[PDB]
């Protein structure tokens with residue numbers, strides 16, 4: 057029964073059986089209780105601070121051909137761009153001026169910068185007294201080492217799907233094995249490390265989602281980024297169904313319940329498939345938000361999926377917008393860099 061699954065979740069009985077049932081039950085009352093539980097756990101372990109990570113999507117050049125992604129190399133129906141290192145550093149500075157305490161640098165897997173240009177940029181941004189998070193994809197261990205030495209604090213490398221067969225089909229250049237090795241390497245080098253998956257991928261099952269939850273729990277990641285699959289018309293998956301918002305929200309809720317002291321964003325994809333989706337997600341276990349800080353004319357060209365929010369807004373709109381969001385939610389902005397604050401328990 058729903059009540060019994062909740063009781064088992066409250067007792068930390070995180071068995072594969074309990075998780076599958078949580079994700080399988082479609083009862084409104086159960087879902088609402090699950091969301092309330094995650095919301096409460098969030099409040100108790102990580103408080104009311106919502107940490108703002110200003111994201112600069114500095115290049116849409118990619119060497120990989122992931123079947124879901126609008127930046128995949130086979131997509132010829134996309135103007136490619138690269139911000140200069142000077143543009144990136146000064147764009148970060150403007151975010152810092154606007155109060156950002158973390159700068160996230162995200163890109164396609166664009167060889168041009170790797171590794172030295174990134175290292176240079178990271179060094180300049182670290183001078184500003186903020187955290188630096190990288191989200192640049194899979195690279196050799198030596199690049200990750202150089203970036204850590206340059207002062208990067210965190211690395212986001214969503215695991216996408218913990219089903220290796222699905223993973224290899226959707227990401228034909230690589231493998232789940234590679235992805236995991238990258239994540240373990242990032243952990244070994246001392247990064248705060250972020251994983252996470254998409255929900256509603258073509259061919260992905262509820263059991264797969266359970267496996268994603270158990271994977272996250274096993275590796276105790278510092279951040280977990282979860283969003284629905286959103287089909288992109290210039291990709292092989294154009295005609296596939298989008299991920300379900302409620303199911304994805306349950307995955308966020310259960311991630312909070314499983315990893316109570318983790319950092320969990322309300323992802324842009326959540327706000328894209330449902331108006332006000334991020335705000336809902338922040339009330340169901342999330343404690344991080346990532347306003348778009350990519351400038352025009354480039355912001356509109358970073359089209360991982362269609363309809364992306366923030367694209368029509370002015371260059372500087374998104375930080376103020378999320379500060380308003382945080383206040384209207386009755387929440388507080390992050391005071392510090394919002395690094396993981398581990399609560400050791402049993």
Ligand SMILES: C[C@H](CCC(=O)NCCC[N+](C)(C)CCCS(=O)(=O)[O-])[C@H]1CC[C@H]2[C@@H]3[C@H](O)C[C@@H]4C[C@H](O)CC[C@]4(C)[C@H]3C[C@H](O)[C@]12C
Pocket residue numbers: 152153154155156185375376379
């Ligand atoms: C950038 C310009 C020009 C002056 C400037 O260059 N100001 C640097 C400030 C640096 N900070 C104090 C934010 C660093 C905090 C990091 S610290 O480590 O100290 O915690 C200044 C002038 C007025 C400032 C806005 C208003 O105030 C209202 C609002 C307050 C929020 O709060 C942050 C958002 C917002 C929109 C502000 C953003 C920005 O700021 C503005 C535009």
Ligand SMILES: C[S@@+](CC[C@H](N)C(=O)[O-])C[C@H]1O[C@@H](n2cnc3c(N)ncnc32)[C@H](O)[C@@H]1O
Pocket residue numbers: 124125126127162163164165191192193194212213214216253254283284285286287288325360361
């Ligand atoms: C666009 S990549 C950029 C960073 C780096 N290239 C990488 O792959 O990790 C960032 C994330 O976007 C998400 N993403 C890509 N295409 C998506 C889609 N169609 N719908 C939802 N999320 C998508 C993936 O989960 C991916 O980890």
Ligand code: SF4
Pocket residue numbers: 118119120121122125126127128129163164165193
């Ligand atoms: S998900 Fe990352 S690696 Fe894959 S095509 Fe998109 S930008 Fe490139």
Ligand code: FES
Pocket residue numbers: 346347348365366369373374375377378
């Ligand atoms: S950050 Fe909320 S719409 Fe851009």
Ligand SMILES: [Cl-]
Pocket residue numbers: 109158160189210
């Ligand atoms: Cl971060």
Ligand SMILES: [Cl-]
Pocket residue numbers: 283323324325326
């Ligand atoms: Cl996203």
Ligand SMILES: [S]
Pocket residue numbers: 348365366369373374375377
């Ligand atoms: S925005």
Ligand SMILES: [S]
Pocket residue numbers: 374377378381
């Ligand atoms: S926002």
